[PDB]
């Protein structure tokens, strides 16, 4: 009876030295992400809408153009909603599908449904078009390093559909894509042929990005079983800062601060956390002031903060994967 699902408990990062940190800082481009990955997603994209299809095609196309061996799968399902039965499609992008373990980065790509108001349209820029673009930029920036994976451990990106409630939050009306996918992964043997382990046992850590893009975010350390990885984000932030690799940044105004958070936040990690998956939830507390308003738009995004977080995230991922 292999103990491989316990490996994640002892897994340590392979820390990057100063020269490598400068390389990562120089290898990501916030302006290229902005134009090529983010702007195409700043459209109305609630589930089942024409924009939802356009956002999915954009995400799939940007991944497909990369050199690394990404395997794309669309998880399409039906769910009851306040508006009746509807179809949803989660996007899963995986390197080394048969590898036993994967570090997983995730966000939701749907935008909350609102009828147009005074000619304004809700596009959910921080919620979560920026997180989606950050994941696409990370795949692009780290492409040459990721190509080398072609520790039986690799990387998977998940873009959930239907995270938002169609009305206001309720247990049945929200998290459509993550409740579906967590249940599906929980009942899928992994690796192929396994007798008693599932895809969820293979998820080392689920790093969920949500509501990112506003100024001065503060991310609390929510869970004790991922606290040591939260500490790594703090250390990476501190060292990139000391190396002069972050922009418009101070340690007093650091993003990853020492402090827990006892409450529960309804978000896509919930169905995974309730099935025993370790989660590192990168959602700020408090939420962006523009949360769920028409002002959650491009103009209110903080470019340097997103750039700094791209650098921190990319370093975290390379160190976790020993790349
Ligand atoms: Zn939202």
From Swiss-Prot:
Effect the entry attributes to changing residue 266 to L: Lowers activity by approximately 35%
Subcellular location: Secreted
Covalent S-S links between cysteines: 107-132
Listed result of changing residue 210 to Q: Abolishes activity
Catalytic residues, chain numbering: 163, 210
Phenotype for residue 112 to A: Lowers activity by approximately 40%
Effect caused by changing residue 163 to L/Q: Abolishes activity
Reactions mediated catalytically: N-terminal L-glutaminyl-[peptide] = N-terminal 5-oxo-L-prolyl-[peptide] + NH4(+)
InterPro entries linked: M28_QC, Peptidase_M28, QC/QCL
Superkingdom, taxonomy of origin: Eukaryota
Glycosylation sites: 17, 258
GO annotations of cellular component type: extracellular exosome; extracellular region; ficolin-1-rich granule lumen; specific granule lumen; tertiary granule lumen
Keyword Ribosomal protein: no
Pfam families recorded: Peptidase_M28
Effect of mutating residue 114 to A: Lowers activity by approximately 30%
Main location: secreted
Homology family: Belongs to the glutaminyl-peptide cyclotransferase family.
Its biological purpose: Responsible for the biosynthesis of pyroglutamyl peptides. Has a bias against acidic and tryptophan residues adjacent to the N-terminal glutaminyl residue and a lack of importance of chain length after the second residue. Also catalyzes N-terminal pyroglutamate formation. May be involved in the N-terminal pyroglutamate formation of several amyloid-related plaque-forming peptides.
Record-given protein name: Glutaminyl-peptide cyclotransferase
Annotated organism of origin: Homo sapiens (Human)
């Amino acid at each position: 009876a292999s103990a491989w699902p316990e490996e994640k408990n002892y897994h340590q990062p392979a820390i990057l030295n100063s020269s490598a940190l400068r390389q990562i800082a120089e290898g990501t481009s916030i302006s290229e992400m902005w134009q090529n990955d983010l702007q195409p997603l700043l459209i109305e994209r609630y589930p089942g809408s024409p924009g939802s299809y356009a956002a999915r095609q954009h995400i799939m196309q940007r991944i497909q153009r990369l050199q690394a061996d990404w395997v794309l799968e669309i998880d399409t399902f039906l769910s009851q909603t306040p508006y009746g039965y509807r179809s949803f499609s989660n996007i899963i992008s995986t390197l080394n599908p048969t590898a036993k373990r994967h570090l997983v980065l995730a966000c939701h790509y749907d935008s909350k449904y609102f009828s147009h108001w005074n000619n304004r349209v809700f596009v959910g820029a921080t919620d979560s078009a920026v997180p989606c673009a950050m994941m696409l930029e990370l795949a692009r920036a780290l492409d040459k390093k990721l190509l080398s994976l072609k520790p039986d451990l690799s990387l998977q990106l998940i873009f959930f559909d239907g995270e938002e409630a169609f009305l206001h939050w309720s247990p049945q009306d929200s998290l459509y894509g993550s409740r579906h996918l967590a249940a599906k992964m929980a009942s899928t043997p992994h690796p192929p042929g396994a007798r008693g382990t599932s895809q969820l046992h293979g998820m080392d850590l689920l790093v969920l990005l949500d509501l990112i893009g506003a100024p001065n975010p503060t991310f609390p350390n929510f869970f004790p079983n991922s606290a040591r990885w939260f500490e790594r984000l703090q250390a990476i932030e501190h060292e990139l800062h000391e190396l002069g690799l972050l922009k418009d940044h101070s340690l007093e105004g650091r993003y990853f601060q020492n402090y827990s958070y006892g409450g529960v936040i309804q978000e896509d990690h919930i169905p995974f956390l309730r099935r025993g998956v370790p989660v590192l939830h990168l959602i700020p507390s408090p939420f962006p002031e523009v949360w769920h308003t028409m002002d959650d738009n491009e103009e209110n995004l903080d470019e340097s903060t997103i750039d700094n977080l791209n650098k921190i995230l990319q370093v975290f991922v390379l160190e976790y994967l020993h790349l």
